[PDB]
Design a protein around this ligand. Structure first.
Ligand SMILES: NC(=O)[C@@H](CCC(=O)O)NC(=O)c1cccc(NCCOCCNC(=O)c2ccc(S(N)(=O)=O)cc2)c1C(=O)O
Ligand SMILES: [Zn+2]
Length: 257
């Protein structure tokens, strides 16, 4: 099945998911000079005060922290969004080295990792129906650079040795995703897709300009995870990022002058 290796990685995905060559694929390079400030964007609102994490899971491609999305608790609204989008999970993409790992790039610059907070449009009732819609999802993307430690990440790092291999999951309650956000909510936005199969074109991307800093030790712990399941040959979970895809007929808007 699909992955990030030579024989099943991004260059192969189109054979099983032809939308991989579609008109609104993600990620993209964000050319900051060609992005245009949009005064029509409303203030972005990230309201995570009532967020309720449930579990953390190694799915063979990344690890997901999943949330209870059965009520309006952790919502994203404003900015480019119409209505309310509810947080369902977050995960990261990262590299084998600090010089790569992000999916989006900024003037071709790659960050060491990228955090994706995944939300679904509440007008569609749940995530499964939302992924049948062109405005079903909103993903808030946050770049990670290696520097000072991010205290709010440490609870995630500390649990990773319990989910080393594909299929392992662990209870993960009371995690506050607000500890993963940078100071500024300045962002770029554009219409795109999931960055992993099935690559569905449902996403309003909101990519924050300001990276968060994590320590080398924190990202090294991400790199100890495994793509493989228990009892299979060990393949370190690294470089689980899709490269930038063609912008085609899209414009990137900036929330800031
Ligand atoms: N062999 C099959 O059956 C194919 C046929 C080919 C096709 O027609 O597609 N069909 C699917 O595979 C499929 C089709 C439609 C819906 C599906 N399930 C729900 C959508 O997938 C949810 C899992 N992913 C995420 O939630 C996610 C991914 C990336 C990001 S990110 N990095 O962008 O933030 C954020 C969230 C699936 C599926 O079973 O997967
Ligand atoms: Zn992602």
């Amino acid at each position: 099945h699909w992955g990030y290796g030579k024989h099943n990685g991004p260059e192969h995905w189109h054979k099983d998911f032809p939308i991989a060559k579609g008109e609104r694929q993600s990620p993209v390079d964000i050319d900051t000079h060609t992005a245009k400030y949009d005064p029509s964007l409303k203030p972005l609102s990230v309201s995570y005060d009532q967020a309720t994490s449930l579990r953390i899971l190694n799915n063979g491609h990344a690890f997901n922290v999943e949330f209870d999305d059965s009520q309006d608790k952790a919502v994203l609204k404003g900015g480019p969004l119409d209505g309310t989008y509810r947080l369902i999970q977050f995960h990261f993409h990262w590299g084998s080295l600090d010089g790569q790992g992000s999916e989006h790039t900024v003037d071709k610059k790659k960050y060491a990792a990228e955090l994706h907070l995944v939300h679904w449009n509440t007008k569609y009732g749940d995530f499964g129906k939302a992924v049948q819609q062109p405005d079903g999802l909103a993903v808030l993307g946050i770049f990670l650079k290696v520097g000072s430690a991010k205290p709010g990440l440490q609870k995630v790092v500390d649990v990773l040795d319990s989910i080393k291999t594909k299929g392992k999951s662990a209870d993960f309650t009371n995690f506050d995703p607000r500890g993963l956000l940078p100071e500024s909510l300045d962002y770029w936005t554009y219409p795109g897709s999931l960055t992993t199969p099935p690559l569905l074109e449902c996403v309003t991307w909101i990519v924050l300009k300001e990276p968060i800093s994590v320590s080398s030790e924190q990202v090294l712990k991400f790199r100890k995870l495994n793509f493989n399941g228990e009892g299979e040959p060990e393949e370190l979970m690294v470089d689980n990022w899709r490269p930038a895809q063609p912008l085609k007929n899209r414009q990137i808007k900036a929330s800031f002058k």
